[PDB]
Amino acid sequence: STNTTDNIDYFDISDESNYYLISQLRPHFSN
Amino acid sequence: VPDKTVRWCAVSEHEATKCQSFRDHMKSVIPSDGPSVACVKKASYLDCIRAIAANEADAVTLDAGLVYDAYLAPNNLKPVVAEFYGSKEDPQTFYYAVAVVKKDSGFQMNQLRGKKSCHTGLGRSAGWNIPIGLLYCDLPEPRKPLEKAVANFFSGSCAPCADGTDFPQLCQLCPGCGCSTLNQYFGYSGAFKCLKDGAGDVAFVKHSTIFENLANKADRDQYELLCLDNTRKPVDEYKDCHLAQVPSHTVVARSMGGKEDLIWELLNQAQEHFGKDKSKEFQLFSSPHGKDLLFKDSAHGFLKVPPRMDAKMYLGYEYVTAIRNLREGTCPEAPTDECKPVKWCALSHHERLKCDEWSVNSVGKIECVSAETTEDCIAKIMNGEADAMSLDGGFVYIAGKCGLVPVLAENYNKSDNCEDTPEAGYFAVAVVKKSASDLTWDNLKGKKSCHTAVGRTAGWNIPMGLLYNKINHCRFDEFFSEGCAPGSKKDSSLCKLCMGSGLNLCEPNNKEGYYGYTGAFRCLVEKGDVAFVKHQTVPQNTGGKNPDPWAKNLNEKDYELLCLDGTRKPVEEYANCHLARAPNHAVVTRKDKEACVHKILRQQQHLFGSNVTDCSGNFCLFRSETKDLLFRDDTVCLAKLHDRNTYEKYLGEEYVKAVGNLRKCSTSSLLEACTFRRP
Amino acid sequence: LQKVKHSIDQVTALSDGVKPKQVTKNRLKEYYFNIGNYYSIFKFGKDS
Numbered sequence: 001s002t003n004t005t006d007n008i009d010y011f012d013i014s015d016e017s018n019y020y021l022i023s024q025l026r027p028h029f030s031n
Numbered sequence: 032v033p034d035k036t037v038r039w040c041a042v043s044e045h046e047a048t049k050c051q052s053f054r055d056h057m058k059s060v061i062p063s064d065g066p067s068v069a070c071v072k073k074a075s076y077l078d079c080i081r082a083i084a085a086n087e088a089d090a091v092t093l094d095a096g097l098v099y100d101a102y103l104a105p106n107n108l109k110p111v112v113a114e115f116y117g118s119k120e121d122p123q124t125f126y127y128a129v130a131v132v133k134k135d136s137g138f139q140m141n142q143l144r145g146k147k148s149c150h151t152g153l154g155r156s157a158g159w160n161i162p163i164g165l166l167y168c169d170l171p172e173p174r175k176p177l178e179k180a181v182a183n184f185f186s187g188s189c190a191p192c193a194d195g196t197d198f199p200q201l202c203q204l205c206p207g208c209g210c211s212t213l214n215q216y217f218g219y220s221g222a223f224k225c226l227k228d229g230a231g232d233v234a235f236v237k238h239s240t241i242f243e244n245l246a247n248k249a250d251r252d253q254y255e256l257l258c259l260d261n262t263r264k265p266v267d268e269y270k271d272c273h274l275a276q277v278p279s280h281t282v283v284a285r286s287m288g289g290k291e292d293l294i295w296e297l298l299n300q301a302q303e304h305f306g307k308d309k310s311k312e313f314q315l316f317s318s319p320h321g322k323d324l325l326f327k328d329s330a331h332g333f334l335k336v337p338p339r340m341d342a343k344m345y346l347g348y349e350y351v352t353a354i355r356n357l358r359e360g361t362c363p364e365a366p367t368d369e370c371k372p373v374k375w376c377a378l379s380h381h382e383r384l385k386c387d388e389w390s391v392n393s394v395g396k397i398e399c400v401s402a403e404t405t406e407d408c409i410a411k412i413m414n415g416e417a418d419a420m421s422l423d424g425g426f427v428y429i430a431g432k433c434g435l436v437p438v439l440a441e442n443y444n445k446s447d448n449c450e451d452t453p454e455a456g457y458f459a460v461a462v463v464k465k466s467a468s469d470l471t472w473d474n475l476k477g478k479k480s481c482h483t484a485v486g487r488t489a490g491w492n493i494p495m496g497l498l499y500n501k502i503n504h505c506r507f508d509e510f511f512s513e514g515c516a517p518g519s520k521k522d523s524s525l526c527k528l529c530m531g532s533g534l535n536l537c538e539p540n541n542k543e544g545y546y547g548y549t550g551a552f553r554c555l556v557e558k559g560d561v562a563f564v565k566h567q568t569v570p571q572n573t574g575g576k577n578p579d580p581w582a583k584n585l586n587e588k589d590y591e592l593l594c595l596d597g598t599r600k601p602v603e604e605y606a607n608c609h610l611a612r613a614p615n616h617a618v619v620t621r622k623d624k625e626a627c628v629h630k631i632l633r634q635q636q637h638l639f640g641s642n643v644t645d646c647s648g649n650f651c652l653f654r655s656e657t658k659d660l661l662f663r664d665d666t667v668c669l670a671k672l673h674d675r676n677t678y679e680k681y682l683g684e685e686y687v688k689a690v691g692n693l694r695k696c697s698t699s700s701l702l703e704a705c706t707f708r709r710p
Numbered sequence: 711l712q713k714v715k716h717s718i719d720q721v722t723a724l725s726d727g728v729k730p731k732q733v734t735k736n737r738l739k740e741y742y743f744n745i746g747n748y749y750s751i752f753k754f755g756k757d758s
């Protein structure tokens with residue numbers, strides 16, 4: 001049945017200031 | 032709750048107005064996730080200090096002399112952000128306290144009695160504590176309470192924040208003493224206004240005040256300052272006749288709740304945009320309606336206070352002793368015949384037993400106060416709870432930076448005349464085994480290392496300096512696979528090989544089994560590949576001299592100590608294989624207790640020293656149970672130091688340079704805290 | 711989920727509210743910038 005993972009775009013990182021969060025989803029910013 | 036706004040104190044409506052402007056213009060450049068300012072209004076500084084203590088405010092800026100009123104119980108505040116006053120090329124943390132008077136008034140410092148005086152506030156540094164403390168012991172008894180006898184010494188004065196109901200003479204020039212900018216005589220500009228209006232004859236300010244208020248050179252040409260040795264002097268050469276130096280104004284905060292990182296974030300991002308004329312629109316260090324609001328006008332930037340430095344270390348020992356003896360009112364006599372007993376410092380319960388036994392075997396001249404790590408005990412010598420201790424040169428360097436001098440040294444070679452003869456110092460070696468004959472000083476990478484402790488000479492400085500020349504990395508957990516270096520951070524592998532448990536792992540004291548010289552030798556015997564110890568470690572531990580089980584089976588022959596070129600040479604001749612000369616351990620103390628520690632220790636070592644045989648059944652100061660308690664076990668006598676009592680004099684040039692090549696790499700917080708003092 | 715719940719609580723918390731009709735121009739600027747930031751957190755939080 002299910003043996004693999006197709007989606008990875010939940011992985012992310014923010015800045016060192018933790019002010020801006022990047023997503024791998026579109027459009028990567030709330031701004 | 033946004034939970035990142037920083038509430039703040041304002042004293043009056045002018046400072047509240049500058050607080051609101053500061054809020055509006057600091058809203059712009061910071062993101063909305065970042066910190067923000069909230070303005071809380073109080074009536075004086077004291078209501079603000081109680082407000083921060085009762086969690087209604089978070090920060091305020093005040094003098095050093097009010098930091099002494101701030102860190103007392105139940106307030107328990109702490110300085111967190113200092114500030115510098117010079118140009119950005121040379122930051123100056125201190126500033127100068129001066130006494131500014133009208134021209135040709137015709138009195139020196141001795142003829143000061145009964146003149147009208149203008150003080151900048153009750154308890155502030157350059158206005159109250161330095162001017163009163165200079166002329167303090169000339170007042171007639173009773174000195175207590177202070178401001179009563181000061182109120183009799185002066186014929187009318189203005190000191191803000193003093194009690195006008197209980198004392199009228201302090202509030203004689205000023206109509207009613209008020210702790211605000213709303214008082215026209217409060218502050219640096221207020222005291223100089225008290226001089227300019229002619230209501231006062233002398234005003235006490237800092238050096239920059241007359242340059243701030245006056246812009247015409249003739250107005251600088253009239254007013255004068257009086258000196259310590261009773262001369263007049265013009266104000267432009269203020270470096271010659273300053274009364275005393277003082278630390279900066281400081282932002283205070285709570286001790287536990289803080290919060291430090293958010294104040295430093297906010298004031299840092301305010302500093303880069305608004306402080307030194309970066310924007311013409313808003314100014315951080317000036318305002319049109321009032322001056323000296325929220326900060327000084329003479330400040331030019333902020334500096335972070337390191338996390339080890341509290342208030343009592345921030346003010347120094349001399350200034351805390353001055354404010355305490357001034358507030359209580361003792362005016363000391365100091366006969367040099369008698370001496371109070373010495374408060375020796377010990378650590379971690381294996382030093383305390385032998386210290387207390389020495390306190391009873393001595394008649395009473397030695398008393399014991401203890402700590403848990405040696406960095407706490409150096410600070411405990413600095414504050415005043417302790418007097419002297421014995422350190423190796425790696426910590427005699429640090430305590431030499433903090434302001435301590437070495438008095439006596441330890442000799443490690445027997446002679447008929449050892450007390451007068453200076454010793455050249457012991458050697459630092461690395462020890463490997465015969466079973467691992469493939470080892471070379473050229474290749475130590477990925478091999479297991481054993482150290483004495485972080486910061487010591489033969490264990491840390493001499494090896495990692497040479498390895499710092501070879502690797503060019505500051506970190507040493509990458510070059511070595513594992514090892515045991517006590518005092519390191521818990522996250523490194525250098526604590527992953529050590530042995531003590533539980534929660535006593537890598538604690539730099541005798542609770543760790545691998546601490547010291549002999550403990551590092553147990554690191555080499557049990558789990559290590561190389562050890563870094565002194566050159567005499569193997570003859571003491573091997574040969575069946577230790578009654579411990581691990582050391583009786585060890586032979587002196589099969590160990591071997593490697594040179595720096597790559598040659599493999601045995602233990603009996605250390606003079607072939609030595610990394611560098613290390614200086615001896617020394618006894619350090621403060622400057623004022625130099626003579627008494629000298630006399631008590633020489634008088635004390637003649638009774639309990641090295642000539643005492645039959646050690647069990649009696650007392651020995653130097654002979655210990657193989658753990659080097661309070662001294663190193665091979666110490667024959669304590670050599671007298673004359674003409675060489677300074678860390679750079681005693682330690683010699685090559686070792687000081689060798690630590691100076693490791694200057695950017697050391698991670699001890701106490702060195703950082705003692706190096707913030709230097710401008 | 712924490713960001714979504716906080717943004718909903720902030721916007722509804724402003725809709726509780728004192729409801730001022732009159733603001734200053736900079737107050738209008740941080741006003742619109744503020745609530746636009748909150749709704750931005752809501753949209754990004756939804757897709758996440």
Ligand SMILES: *[C@@H]1O[C@H](CO)[C@@H](O[C@@H]2O[C@H](CO)[C@@H](O)[C@H](O)[C@H]2NC(C)=O)[C@H](O)[C@H]1NC(C)=O
Pocket residue numbers: 444445446447452
């Ligand atoms: C360690 O001390 C011993 C004895 O104190 C030193 O031996 C010296 O040997 C010379 C031989 O000519 C004598 O004249 C000296 O009187 C001895 N004593 C001193 C204090 O020099 C030995 O040289 C010392 N070794 C080290 C490395 O310090």
Ligand SMILES: *[C@@H]1O[C@H](CO)[C@@H](O)[C@H](O)[C@H]1NC(C)=O
Pocket residue numbers: 637638642643
């Ligand atoms: C050795 O110690 C004993 C102990 O009382 C003392 O009498 C003697 O003077 C000491 N000798 C020297 C040379 O210091």
Ligand SMILES: [Fe+3]
Pocket residue numbers: 094095155156157280
């Ligand atoms: Fe000041």
Ligand SMILES: [Fe+3]
Pocket residue numbers: 423424487488489616
């Ligand atoms: Fe040492």
